[PDB]
Design a protein around this ligand. Structure first.
Ligand SMILES: *[C@@H]1O[C@H](CO)[C@@H](O[C@@H]2O[C@H](CO)[C@@H](O)[C@H](O)[C@H]2NC(C)=O)[C@H](O)[C@H]1NC(C)=O
Ligand code: NAG
Ligand code: NAG
Ligand code: NAG
Lengths: 209, 49
């Protein structure tokens, strides 16, 4: 299935603070009102990573508990698995295959930490897996929000595909990033309060110019 | 360096002016924000008969 992005997926591109200053930048980003792939759990198939992955999932019980990020995803590559068990967000790159039905009940890296909304943006530059994420309770919310880089992985590990995971003893949305020019609204306390995608409409280019 | 009370976001290590000149930094020893103003100068004029 498919739906609309609804001005979501905007993250902080730089750590520059600006107070009441409108700043324009070019970076890989989700396009505004872009088409995002929708799957409802009855499935969790294998999808390509492309240049970037935008992820959004709204579950009250958080049925989605894990993701796996690997090039071939058949224990032939260092598949980055990010699985949240209990309150501990656990990140590993093991070459051990998971269960036959992918649900929760060579590990060169280990990090251990519809009410609820979780938004994610994944991209991989020079091996550093960059995750812009947000967790807050509330298809997609229409209001604007700014995603923060909650974690930035120093793993240095090449990834070209991904697959989400479930848990048993969920509606999620998958989008792809694009090179787009934005205009960003930094408020008095540096929070990005508004965003304009220049490659959307001519009013947006007039605001960008 | 000043006794600034600027409030930064926790990921934001630096800041810039309207002309993108760096005006405030996050000190690694003390995570409060210090505004940076480079030192005074000016032209020199000689008033003489
Ligand atoms: C949740 O998963 C993590 C990942 O294994 C478990 O926590 C750590 O597991 C490693 C693996 O050997 C240990 O070396 C650490 O000592 C564990 N603790 C911490 C704080 O890092 C954890 O046990 C799992 N929780 C449950 C309930 O299964
Ligand atoms: C996305 O594509 C699907 C199928 O091609 C279509 O039904 C849907 O309306 C599209 N959504 C947008 C926002 O273009
Ligand atoms: C990552 O691995 C895939 C699969 O082996 C390969 O096609 C791709 O070129 C690799 N990328 C880098 C940057 O090594
Ligand atoms: C910014 O932070 C200050 C801290 O004193 C607060 O008073 C203010 O409400 C915040 N928001 C804006 C929009 O200024």
């Amino acid at each position: 299935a498919y739906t609309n992005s609804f001005t979501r997926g905007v993250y902080y591109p730089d750590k520059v603070f600006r107070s009441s200053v409108l700043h324009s930048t070019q970076d890989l980003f989700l396009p505004f009102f872009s088409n995002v792939t929708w799957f409802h759990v009855i499935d969790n198939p294998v999808l390509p990573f492309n240049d970037g992955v935008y992820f959004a999932s709204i579950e009250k019980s958080n049925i989605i508990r894990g993701w796996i990020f690997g090039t071939t995803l058949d224990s032939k590559t260092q598949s980055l698995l990010i699985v949240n068990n209990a309150t501990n967000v656990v990140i590993k790159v093991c070459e051990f295959q998971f269960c036959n039905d992918p649900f929760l009940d060579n590990c060169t890296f280990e990090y251990v930490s519809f009410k609820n909304l979780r938004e994610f943006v994944f991209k991989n530059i020079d091996g550093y897996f960059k995750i812009y994420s947000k967790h807050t309770p509330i298809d997609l919310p229409q209001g604007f929000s700014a995603l923060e880089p909650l974690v930035d992985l120093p793993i240095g590990i090449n990834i070209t595909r991904f697959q989400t995971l479930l848990a048993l003893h969920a509606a999620y949305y998958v989008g792809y990033l694009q090179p787009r020019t934005f205009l960003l609204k930094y408020n008095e306390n540096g929070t990005i309060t508004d965003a304009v995608d220049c490659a959307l409409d001519p009013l947006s280019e007039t605001k960008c110019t | 360096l000043t006794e600034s009370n600027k409030k930064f976001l926790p990921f934001q290590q630096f800041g810039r002016d309207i002309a993108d000149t760096t005006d405030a930094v996050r000190d690694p020893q003390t995570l409060e924000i210090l505004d940076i103003t480079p030192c005074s100068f000016g032209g020199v004029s000689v008033i003489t008969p």
